[PDB]
RNA sequence: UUAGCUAGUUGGUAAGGUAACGGCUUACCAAGGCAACGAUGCAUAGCCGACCUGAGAGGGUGAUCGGCCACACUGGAACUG
RNA sequence: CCUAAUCAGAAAGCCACGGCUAACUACGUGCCAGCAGCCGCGGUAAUACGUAGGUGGCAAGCGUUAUCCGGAAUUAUUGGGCGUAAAGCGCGCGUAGGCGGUUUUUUAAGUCUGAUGUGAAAGCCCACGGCUCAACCGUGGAGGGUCAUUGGAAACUGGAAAA
RNA sequence: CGACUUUCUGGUCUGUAACUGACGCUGAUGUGCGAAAGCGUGGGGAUCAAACAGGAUUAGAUACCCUGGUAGUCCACGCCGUAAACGAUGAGUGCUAAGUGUUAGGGGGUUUCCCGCCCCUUAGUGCUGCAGCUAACGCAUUAAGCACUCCGCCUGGGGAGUA
């Protein structure tokens, strides 16, 4: 159960940072009628090379090869995610000043609240992104109090 | 069926749906108009890369990555092939292909011409694998 | 007539029993003259020579007449057996006999020049070549009915 | 409902073909009488006969089987069936098994065989295929 | 323009609920592309009865003379079979 | 592509005139070698006629298909078409010892169709038509030598050593162009 | 998993108006008129000739090219001829 | 486009080889890497990884992918079922409609059966002309209506009438 | 759809041919009828009975083994319209070896009622089986054999009868 997968989290968080010295921000498992899919978001550096995923997956799989208190075998999903992150905290927005983010704010336009812009600078609640919508350039201050949903976005 | 009911009916076929949702650029970059472009290729980036593990006995560790093409539509896609030099948020070309590794995915990257560079040590990449004739 | 064997393939049928799994090499041969005669046969064996022996022995027994004109059936019909039906029709010369592989071998063991044909229904070779032998056994000729009917050739005639 | 005369005529003919007997009779029509005469002309019906009684008279057929009670003909089927009023013009005349296979065709004057059809070149409602 | 047969259409009068105008329903039937069986279909024709003298069930031929009103196209040429309960 | 087989080694495989030839080539070719399939037989038919001729499919399958439009035969119609093909008739005229020999002659185009420069080996001969010999250089070594060695001149071919040209006469048949192999087989090959 | 549409609409009356035609639009009077044989609504679409595969049947397609139609930042016009 | 010369001399490859389908062995490799369209192979020994040879297929191109049909008859009019693999409401009444008994006439509506006008052109098929040829346009023919009209016809269906 | 009976009707067929003279046909839409449960309401509640609880069991115990009782089952109408309502065999048509019964008929002869027999069919419902056909299974005069007008479905599995 959840307690069990947490126990696996502590036991296998050792390797991750004695192997690739990564840290798992979490391990979560999804299942659809088969060995469930334990997505372990491995961190360390942000721009994780694919090799830095292959070798890390080798390490973690070998670690759990002899370690599986959970009776059945399961899919290890070794994830080395990028910077893309849901922006709940203000620091989440502060780190992302480099990269574009998209937010859903209490005042939408055209029915839906979700809009993507590319941050130029950090200004507390106010936003000076080069938000680009409909091929339109502008720095639009999106009030965070309006923001019902906010996530850091892909850079493309 | 009877001739009359045959007449007042089309006898419709069982026409399929393309299991490859290959909606290429079409009108994505104006008006965001959905357009069934059948392009064999769009340019686009894999914002994240990953690696799910296969089960035993063939522990053939397969690696995935989530990608956005010219239409920028989310999908987790596996990488085939040996050797690469790309990373997170690298531009990649993905071809349509469903393999025995994992469900939830029906496409595949191609090697040789973009950030996921192929290897020119073999001779099979003489006309393919993105790499030139091994000379 | 001069017996010319024609097998289709060799399937191994693992009649697994208590303990062992006895697989018999099963092969069906069709024996014909390719000039107006053909006959199929069946044989379950453990090897190619035994299978060909038995199936050719069975096949050379039962034969057919293959009534032809221009080395070709005077009419056109279709063969049907157990949904393994096939269709047949003559063809203009120099065009060749066209049909699916195994039944094409059947008809060359009947020895025809030009035929419109194509396999249908079942793709199982045994069933379709059986529909084929049924159809070929259901050939006739203009003289046959010119006798059978009081009327003769050249008035009601191909 | 006895929708079509051709259909029942031909299915009972095929039934007799299976059962291998010759003397059979059936309620006719004028067209049934004429086509039975055409049959005796073709021969495979050794003899036909018509009388009158309720409502159309019983046509009386007496087949010409083979030497060993075999079908001199091979196959037989209707063409013009309910709903399908199907017509053939001069060139639209078909040739089931060429001359060997035959088919009467009703034409602007009457019912004529395939030989007559391609002969006098008046098309019409193709009736039934026999071969 | 009588040499030109205009557009004559034998058909039945189905209604007259218009000032000096009736509607003739002249029946046809179109072939099937795959099949060949069909059923009778028609086109109602808003037609000018010069005094609404027509009656329901009036089998009648008509004549295309002029666009007379909305879809009012065909003059009557001759009342053929003006009928009542038979 | 056009013609790039050693041919004798290819004939080793095909057993067709143009030691080890009784066998296949390559590592185990002379050793015990594979059998043949009916589809493989048809493929061989294709080679034994075209690799015989020395032409490529873009020139060839079209010619195969143009046989099926006229009345009567098709296989024999393709037989005469190959005969009408350029190199086959001149080869039969003893002006070549293999189809590969005069193919250089005709692409080089020392042949002159009725005294007209046609330098495609893909040209089509016809009855009442004949060739010339580019009199400027009509008497080179190999050309006059092959003129000396002409085994025979079939009915459709009308040519003499002094005539310097053959003219087509009558639609040949496989009874006149040798190596009779099943034309029905080869038409079946391109059928499906 | 598109069933009611429907009021100049229906028809005529008089005017005007256009090449004509008529609600075509005005005023009149009257209530029509369409609606499962699928109007209506929605999506979508240029049209066809033509073309691709298919033995054909068929299916599919609609590049230039033939013509026909629609449009010319957007809407509302109108002068011109 | 053609002529004076230029040599074999510039100019060609690629795909595949377990089979399916044409072509295989040797080797290094080691169930691992992997290959991977399908069966699945690879565990050290692989003609299924890679390499060399050898072969095949093919070529001014080859291979991959995107799609349409053939296949796919996988619409089953041609060319499916519903006895069970998918299918009979749960079972009715019945409107329209679907088809229409025997015989006698008319009709010609159909139907058939020609004539007419009329099917842009091209493509379209055929033949043929040119372009070396091909490609190709061209030329004519053919084809091309389910169009309208009229000649017969009355078997048939549909009427009409008569039972 | 079975306790009995009646109500005031619906249907069943033998023979019948009585004779207008096709009046027939299945049947989109529509559309009635309709297991059970459930349920609205208004009663009953005799069981039965979920839930339930006492309560074994066991921290837990309804889990089941208890004890009782339990919405409702049951009466009035609706909602209910659904199911294994399944033969997943639409209907009607008429043809086609047999053997061989039935359920009602009739007839002929047979004999005392032949009721006793037989045989012919009437119209169904059997079992075996000609032919036929099905992958097989088997039907096979009551076809799943042969044909015909008219209805619906089915389109891999399942996703999901679910959204």
UniProtKB/Swiss-Prot annotation, chain B:
GO terms for biological process: translation. Disulfide bonds: none annotated. Keywords: Methylation, Ribonucleoprotein, Ribosomal protein, RNA-binding, rRNA-binding, tRNA-binding. GO terms for molecular function: rRNA binding; structural constituent of ribosome; tRNA binding. The keyword rRNA-binding applies. It comes from the Bacteria. It holds the Pfam family Ribosom_S12_S23. GO terms for cellular component: small ribosomal subunit. InterPro entries: NA-bd_OB-fold, Ribosomal_uS12, Ribosomal_uS12_bac. Gene3D superfamilies: Nucleic acid-binding proteins. Residues 1-56, 117-135 are annotated as: Disordered. Signal peptide: none annotated. The modification 3-methylthioaspartic acid is found at residue 101. Belongs to the universal ribosomal protein uS12 family. With S4 and S5 plays an important role in translational accuracy. NCBIfam families: rpsL_bact. Part of the 30S ribosomal subunit. Contacts proteins S8 and S17. May interact with IF1 in the 30S initiation complex. This is Small ribosomal subunit protein uS12. It comes from Staphylococcus aureus (strain COL). The lineage of its organism: Bacteria, Bacillati, Bacillota, Bacilli, Bacillales.
Curated annotation (Swiss-Prot), chain C:
SUPFAM superfamilies: dsRNA-binding domain-like, Ribosomal protein S5 domain 2-like. The keyword Ribosomal protein applies. Coiled coil: none annotated. Keywords: Ribonucleoprotein, Ribosomal protein, RNA-binding, rRNA-binding. It comes from the Bacteria. GO terms for molecular function: rRNA binding; structural constituent of ribosome. PROSITE patterns: RIBOSOMAL_S5, S5_DSRBD. Belongs to the universal ribosomal protein uS5 family. NCBIfam families: rpsE_bact. PANTHER family: MITOCHONDRIAL RIBOSOMAL PROTEIN S5 (PTHR48277:SF1). Part of the 30S ribosomal subunit. Contacts proteins S4 and S8. This is Small ribosomal subunit protein uS5. The gene is rpsE.
Swiss-Prot record, chain E:
Transmembrane segments: none annotated. HAMAP family: Ribosomal_uS17_B. This is Small ribosomal subunit protein uS17. InterPro entries: NA-bd_OB-fold, Ribosomal_uS17, Ribosomal_uS17_bact/chlr, Ribosomal_uS17_CS. Keywords: Ribonucleoprotein, Ribosomal protein, RNA-binding, rRNA-binding. One of its GO terms (cellular component) is cytosolic small ribosomal subunit. Part of the 30S ribosomal subunit. It holds the Pfam family Ribosomal_S17. The keyword RNA-binding applies. One of its GO terms (molecular function) is rRNA binding. It comes from Staphylococcus aureus (strain NCTC 8325 / PS 47).
UniProtKB/Swiss-Prot annotation, chain F:
GO terms for cellular component: small ribosomal subunit. Gene3D superfamilies: Ribosomal Protein S4 Delta 41, Chain A, domain 1, RNA-binding S4 domain. It comes from the Bacteria. One of its GO terms (biological process) is translation. Residues 84-147 form the S4 RNA-binding domain. Pfam families: Ribosomal_S4, S4. GO terms for molecular function: rRNA binding; structural constituent of ribosome. NCBIfam families: PRK05327.1, rpsD_bact. Belongs to the universal ribosomal protein uS4 family. This is Small ribosomal subunit protein uS4.
């Amino acid at each position: 159960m959840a307690s069990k997968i947490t126990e696996q989290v502590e036991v296998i968080v050792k390797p991750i940072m004695e192997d690739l010295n990564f840290e798992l921000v979490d391990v979560e498992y999804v299942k659809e009628g088969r060995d469930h899919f334990l997505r372990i978001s491995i961190d360390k550096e942000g721009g994780v090379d694919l090799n830095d995923c292959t070798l890390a997956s080798e390490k973690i799989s070998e670690a759990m090869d002899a370690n599986d208190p959970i009776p059945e075998m399961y899919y290890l999903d070794v994830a080395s995610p990028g910077a893309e992150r849901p922006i709940k905290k203000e620091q989440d927005f502060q780190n992302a000043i480099t990269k574009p983010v998209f937010v859903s704010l209490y005042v939408p336009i055209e029915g839906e609240k979700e809009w993507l812009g590319i941050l130029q600078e950090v200004n507390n609640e106010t936003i000076v992104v080069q938000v680009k919508i409909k091929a339109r350039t502008k720095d639009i201050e999106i009030p965070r109090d309006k923001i019902a949903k906010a996530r850091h976005a892909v850079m493309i | 069926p009877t001739i009359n009911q045959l007449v007042r009916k089309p006898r419709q076929s069982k026409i399929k749906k393309s299991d490859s949702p290959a909606l290429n650029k079409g009108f994505n970059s104006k008006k965001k108009k959905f357009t069934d472009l059948n392009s064999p290729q769009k340019r686009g980036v894999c914002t994240r890369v990953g690696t799910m593990t296969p089960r035993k006995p063939n522990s053939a560790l397969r690696k995935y990555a989530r990608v956005r093409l010219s239409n920028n539509i989310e999908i987790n896609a596996y990488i085939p092939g040996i050797g690469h030099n790309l990373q997170e948020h690298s531009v990649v070309l993905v071809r349509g292909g469903r393999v025995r590794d994992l469900p939830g995915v029906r496409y595949h990257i191609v090697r040789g011409a973009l950030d996921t560079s192929g290897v020119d040590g073999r001779r099979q990449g003489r006309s393919l694998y993105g790499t030139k004739k091994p000379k | 007539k001069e017996f010319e064997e024609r097998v289709v393939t060799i399937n191994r049928v693992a009649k697994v029993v208590k303990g062992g799994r006895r697989f018999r090499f099963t092969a069906l041969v069709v024996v014909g003259d390719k000039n107006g005669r053909v006959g199929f046969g069946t044989g379950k064996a453990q090897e190619v020579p035994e299978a060909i022996k038995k199936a050719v022995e069975a096949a050379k027994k039962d034969l057919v007449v293959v009534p032809r004109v221009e080395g070709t059936t005077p009419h056109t019909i279709t063969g049907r057996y157990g949904s393994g039906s096939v269709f047949m029709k003559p063809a203009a010369p120099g065009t060749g006999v066209i049909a699916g592989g195994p039944v094409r071998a059947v008809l060359e063991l009947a020895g025809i020049t030009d035929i419109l044909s194509k396999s249908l229904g079942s793709n199982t070779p045994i069933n379709m070549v059986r529909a084929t032998i049924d159809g070929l056994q259901n050939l006739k000729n203009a003289e046959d009915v010119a006798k059978l009917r009081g009327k003769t050739v050249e008035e009601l005639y191909n | 409902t006895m929708t079509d005369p051709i259909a029942d005529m031909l299915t009972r003919v095929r039934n007799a073909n299976m059962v291998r007997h010759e003397k059979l009779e059936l309620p006719a029509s004028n067209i049934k009488k004429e086509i039975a005469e055409i049959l005796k002309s073709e021969g495979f019906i050794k003899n036909v006969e018509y009388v009158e009684d309720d409502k159309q008279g019983v046509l009386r057929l007496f087949l010409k089987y083979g030497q060993n009670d075999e079908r001199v003909i091979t196959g037989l089927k209707r063409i013009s069936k309910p709903g399908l009023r199907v017509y053939a013009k001069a060139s639209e005349m078909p040739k089931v098994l060429n001359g060997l296979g035959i088919a009467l065709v009703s034409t602007s004057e009457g019912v004529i065989t395939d030989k007559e059809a391609r002969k006098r070149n008046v098309g019409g409602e193709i009736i039934a295929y026999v071969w | 323009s009588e040499r030109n047969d205009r557009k004559v259409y034998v058909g039945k009068v189905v209604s007259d609920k218009m000032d000096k105008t009736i509607t003739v329903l002249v029946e046809t039937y179109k072939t099937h592309k795959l099949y060949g069986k069909r059923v009778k279909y028609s086109k109602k024709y808003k037609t000018h009865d010069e005094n609404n003298s027509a009656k329901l069930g009036d089998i009648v031929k008509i004549q295309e003379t002029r666009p007379l009103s909305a879809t009012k196209r065909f003059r009557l040429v001759e009342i053929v079979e003006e009928s009542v309960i038979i | 592509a056009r013609f790039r087989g050693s041919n004798w080694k290819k004939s080793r495989r095909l057993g067709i005139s143009l030691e080890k030839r009784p066998y296949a080539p390559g590592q185990h070719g002379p050793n015990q070698r594979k059998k043949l399939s009916e589809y493989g037989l048809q493929l061989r038919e294709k080679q034994k006629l075209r690799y015989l001729y020395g032409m490529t499919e873009r020139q060839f399958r079209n010619t195969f298909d143009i046989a099926g439009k006229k009345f009567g035969v098709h296989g024999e119609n393709f037989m005469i078409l190959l005969a009408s093909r350029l190199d086959a008739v001149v080869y039969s005229l003893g002006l070549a010892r293999t189809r590969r020999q005069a193919r250089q002659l005709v692409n080089h185009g020392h042949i002159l169709v009725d005294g007209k420069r046609v330098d495609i080996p893909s040209y089509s001969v016809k009855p009442g038509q004949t060739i010339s010999v580019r009199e400027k250089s009509q008497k080179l070594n190999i050309i006059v030598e092959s003129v000396e060695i002409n085994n025979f001149v079939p009915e459709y071919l009308n040519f003499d050593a002094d005539s310097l040209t053959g003219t087509f006469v009558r639609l040949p048949e496989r009874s006149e162009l040798p190596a009779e192999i099943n034309e029905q087989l080869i038409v079946e090959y391109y059928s499906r």
